Structure 1
Amino acid sequence: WEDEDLDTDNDNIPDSYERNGYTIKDLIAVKWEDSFAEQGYKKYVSNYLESNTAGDPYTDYEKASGSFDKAIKTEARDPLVAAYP
């Protein structure tokens, strides 16, 4: 509905954030803004009806936060790129 208090897939990121754009800071998802780009933050988009957008064993929140094995390449931290050997 008309508020940012929905989590259909139940992956700790609101529906509209996954739909439009978001980034993780202090292990909490926040709305994306253009001023964040200069500080080195990336813009993430992902499926709001799926817990694992890329199908890999890690959820969207784990990939966006980088809370998985720290030996995985940094490009595999966005939900649209799969971690896969």
Structure 2
Amino acid sequence: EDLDTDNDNIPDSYERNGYTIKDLIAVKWEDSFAEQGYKKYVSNYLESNTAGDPYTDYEKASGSFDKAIKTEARDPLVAAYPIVGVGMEKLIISTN
């Protein structure tokens, strides 16, 4: 259709029926791209960010965000979320 309730670049018919992004534009899914490399994304058409991460649905789907993000965070359902942790190695105690 043409309705866009979330104001992104993916209309709210592909956003719930299944869409794939090629040539920086969204197209319908027909499984013919199955044996080519394209995946099938499905998201929520009432919110700009389906997962909650700063990048929006279209930015996540196309791949216009920072180019160091793993492909597992490609589709809108998965969220880009670092889990940075600190591992301790040793101590040195200065006796004054």
RCO higher in structure (CA 8 A, sep ≥6): 1
User: Highest CA radius of gyration, 1 or 2?
Assistant: 2
Residues 2-40 of structure 1: per-residue CA shift (max 9 Å, x gap): xx0110001110101011100000000000111111111
Q: Secondary structure at the match of 2:59?
A: helix
- TM-score, structure 2 length as denominator? 0.84
CA distance in 1, matches of 2:9, 2:31: 23
- TM-score, structure 1 length as denominator? 0.95
Q: Secondary structure at the match of 2:58?
A: helix
Structure 2 unaligned regions, length at least 5: 83-96
Aligned length: 82
CA distance in 1, matches of 2:30, 2:66: 28
Moved over 6 A (4+): none
When the two chains are superposed, the root-mean-square deviation of aligned CA atoms in Å is 0.5
CA distance in 2, matches of 1:32, 1:65: 15
- Give the equivalent residue in structure 1 for 2:17: 20
Identity of aligned residues (%): 100
